Amino acid sequence: GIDPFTPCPPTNAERLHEFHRAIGAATPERPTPPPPELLRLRQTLLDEESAEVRAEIDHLLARQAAGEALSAGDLAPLAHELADLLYVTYGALDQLGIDADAVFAEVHRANLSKASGPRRADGKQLKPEGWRPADVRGVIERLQHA
Amino acid sequence: GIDPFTMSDLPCPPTNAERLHEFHRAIGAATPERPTPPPPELLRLRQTLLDEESAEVRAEIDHLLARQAAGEALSAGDLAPLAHELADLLYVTYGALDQLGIDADAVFAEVHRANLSKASGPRRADGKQLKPEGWRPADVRGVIERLQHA
User: Where does Mn(2+) 4 bind (chain B) (predicted)?
Assistant: First the structure.
C-alpha cells in the first residue's frame, strides 16, 4: 500500500499556473469557457506585446538597412519582448484552463510530420503522404475528461 | 557511460523550446546553439510569421466575443480554434528565439523570476499590483551575455 518507500522540472506553461496562483487569479485545472471580460483582457495583453515585438524588429531592420552588423547584445530587447509574448500567450491558455503543453505537443506533431515531406522546386514545404493535421478539438476533449 | 542496462527513454519530455530546435533541424534549417545576429531576411520572415499568427488569434477572440455579445454560452469545444491559434503563436515565438540562437527557456526563466517576484507585492486599493520590497527587474542582457559562454 503506502510506506516510507512511497518530478519533472517545471515547464513554462506550468510557470504561468504558478504565476496566476501568485496574483490571485485562481485559474482552472480543466478547459473552462471564459467570461468576455477575461477574453478582452487577454486580447489587449496579446495586442500590446505583439506591437512591442513588431516595433523592435522594425528597429533592428532599420539599423541593418543603415549598414549595421548587429551584435548578440543588440538582440537582448527583442529576446526580452519575445519572452514577454510567450508569457501572455501561455497566460491566455492557462486562464482558459487549457494545458498549453498538451496543445503544443499536438501542433508540434503535425508540424514535424509536415517537415518530412518534399519541397517544391521554389522551396515551399509540401506535406508527405499520410499527414494528419493537429486535432486540437480532440486534445481539448481529452483534457475535459482526464 | 552507457551499457546493456541503460534506459534510453528520458524521464522528462523535451521543453517546447527544445521542440522548436528539433523542428528546425527537420526543415534543414539547423539553428545556432548560442546567440547569433541574424540576417535581415531572417528578421523579416520572423516578423511576418508573428504578424500573421497574432492577427489570427485576434480575429478569433473577436468572434468569440461577438457570440457572447449575442447571448451565447461558450462551450469548452468552442475554444479549440483559439487554443490551436495560441499554440501556433507559441510555435512562431519560440521559432524566432531558436533562429536567433537564443535559449527561450533561459530568457523566459528570468522574465518569470521578475514577474513572480512582482506578484509578491501588495495591491493598491483599486487592485493595481505594486512591486514588493527588494524587487529586481528582469536582466535579459545578462542572460544573453551568459548564453554566449560555456
Answer: 84, 88
DSSP string over B5-49: T---S-SSPPPHHHHHHHHHHHTT----SS--PPPHHHHHHHHHH
The verdict on a CB contact (< 8 Å) between A50 and B54 is yes
B130 three-state secondary structure: coil
Q: Which three cell numbers stand for residue B129?
A: 499590483
Q: Are B106 and B119 in contact (CB under 8 A)?
A: no
A42 touches chain B (CB under 8 A): yes
Local structure of A71: helix, strand or coil: coil
Q: What is the resolution of this structure in A?
A: 1.7
Technique behind the model: X-ray
Give Cα separations from B143 to A10, B14, B61, B99, B112 (angstroms).
19, 21, 34, 17, 13
- Angle of helix A100-115 versus helix A136-145 axis, rounded to 10: 150
- In the numeric block, which cell numbers belong to residue A70? 548587429
Domains of chain A: 1-146 (1.10.3420.10)
Is B57 in CB contact (< 8 Å) with chain A?
A: yes
- How many CA atoms are closer than 13 Å to the CA of A86, on its beta-carbon side? 33
